[PDB]
Amino acid sequence: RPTFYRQELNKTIWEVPERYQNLSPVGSGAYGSVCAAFDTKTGLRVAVKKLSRPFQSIIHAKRTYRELRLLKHMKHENVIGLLDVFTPARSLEEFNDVYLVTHLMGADLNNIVKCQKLTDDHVQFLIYQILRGLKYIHSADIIHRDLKPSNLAVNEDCELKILDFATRWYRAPEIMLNWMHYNQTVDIWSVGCIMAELLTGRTLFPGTDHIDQLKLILRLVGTPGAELLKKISSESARNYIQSLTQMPKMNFANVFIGANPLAVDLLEKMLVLDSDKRITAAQALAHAYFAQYHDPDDEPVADPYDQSFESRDLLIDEWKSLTYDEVISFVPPPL
Ligand SMILES: CN(C)CCNC(=O)c1cc2c(cnn2CC2CCCCC2)cc1Cc1ccc(F)cc1F
Ligand SMILES: Fc1ccc(-c2n[nH]cc2-c2ccncc2)cc1
């Protein structure tokens, strides 16, 4: 066991190993509290997240276990991974706090898309890396569910990482309709919304609520056709759609004028209303828009990921002991 030092940062208190120095608050909210730090063992600038009340309730305890299992499994250049996980407690009885460590990135995509306007080549490379990370995530039967600029970080090399899994302007419309069985291409919808925003500098669907959001989407891609209507079980959904002033699929080349025709074509394949017809991450990496970057032998998939715990009804102490197990079995990655 290493040796710890303590401090108060904002109103959070922090107990971390000596190796992590110069902790500076980066922001805080539901997830927990995040500090930037300098790792003296490796020389890396790292990001340290202290979970908020990880074992306060069954939902918190399960969510804590979920996040740690996920982060420990992701080993991919475009997906955040675990550099380290530690607790100050020396026993399971005292175990009450969890800190997670990952590489610190330079800026989030929210601060690139406002502070400058992005060239087509940057858009190619950035979307390529998202899709490459998404191919790996999806190959593990994992859905991100919350892809958006603020959950994407880039360094000065323009290298990109997807972070923090799970009216929202980037959410697939089958969720605005509350369909219970949405699939992994909800993430592709979000990528479509993001790439559109990098090309125009404007939010694509800046809706004010679930209803306004769906209306902005249908104005671009048009009302659902009969093949898609046949798949909607919800009678209220079905009725609301059949009794809207019907609208045609706009031509995307008109909407996204001046954009590379290949970027427009890919956008048409991502922002399809019917989720069964949406392009997948693996197929999108092979789209000609990414010819400059696509390499089928350097777009790996993930080892299988056991998500059986998701269906379990356990006590707080059981979720907590399972989390402790995962802290101790952690093997840092080869430096
Ligand atoms: C909307 N999100 C923000 C929710 C909260 N996520 C983070 O604050 C976060 C951001 C991260 C990183 C890494 N690089 N950057 C990009 C930032 C860095 C500060 C300013 C420039 C851009 C990590 C984490 C969170 C985090 C995850 C896992 C982990 F093991 C430790 C963690 F710390
Ligand atoms: F208006 C819309 C918008 C999206 C959809 C949709 N796309 N993919 C799947 C669905 C869907 C929606 C509701 N119920 C089942 C399936 C259906 C109607």
Residue numbers in the entry: 5 to 170, 185 to 353
Sentences copied from the publication:
Inhibition of butyrylcholinesterase (BChE) and p38α mitogen-activated protein kinase (p38α MAPK) offers an innovative dual approach to mitigate two major drivers of neurodegeneration in AD: cholinergic deficit and neuroinflammation. Using structure-based drug design and a library of known p38α MAPK inhibitors, we developed first-in-class, selective dual BChE/p38α MAPK inhibitors with balanced activity against both targets. The X-ray crystal structures of the two most promising molecules bound to both enzymes were solved. Structure-based design of MTDLs that simultaneously inhibit p38α MAPK and hBChE led to the identification and subsequent optimization of the first dual inhibitors of these two AD-related target enzymes.
Compounds 94 and 95 showed balanced submicromolar inhibitory potency against hBChE and p38α MAPK, while they did not inhibit AChE at a concentration of 100 μM, which was also one of the main objectives to diminish potential side effects. Compounds 94 and 95 showed high selectivity for p38α MAPK. The KINOMEscan assay showed that off-target inhibition was limited only to structurally related kinases (p38β MAPK, JNK1/2/3, and CDK3) and was absent at 1 μM, where only p38α MAPK was inhibited among the 103 kinases tested. The bulky isobutyl and cyclohexylmethyl groups occupy HR II, delineated by Val30, Ile108, Gly110, Ala111, and Asp112. The 2,4-difluorobenzene sits in HR I defined by Ala51, Lys53, Leu75, Ile84, Leu104, Thr106, and Leu167. The optimal distance of 7.9 Å between the hydrogen bond donor on the indazole core (i.e., the N 2 nitrogen of the indazole) and the 2,4-difluorobenzyl group allows exquisite selectivity toward the structurally and phylogenetically most related kinases. The amide group is critical for effective inhibition of p38α MAPK as it acts as a hydrogen bond donor interacting with Asp168 of the DFG pocket (3.2 Å for compound 94 and 3.6 Å for compound 95). The tertiary amine (i.e., the dimethylamine group) faces the solvent, which explains the retention of p38α MAPK inhibition when this functional group was not present. A statistically significant difference was noted in the latency to NW zone entry between the LPS-treated control group and mice treated with LPS and 95 (p < 0.05). Considering this, it can be concluded that the test compound 95 positively affected spatial memory retention measured in the MWM task.
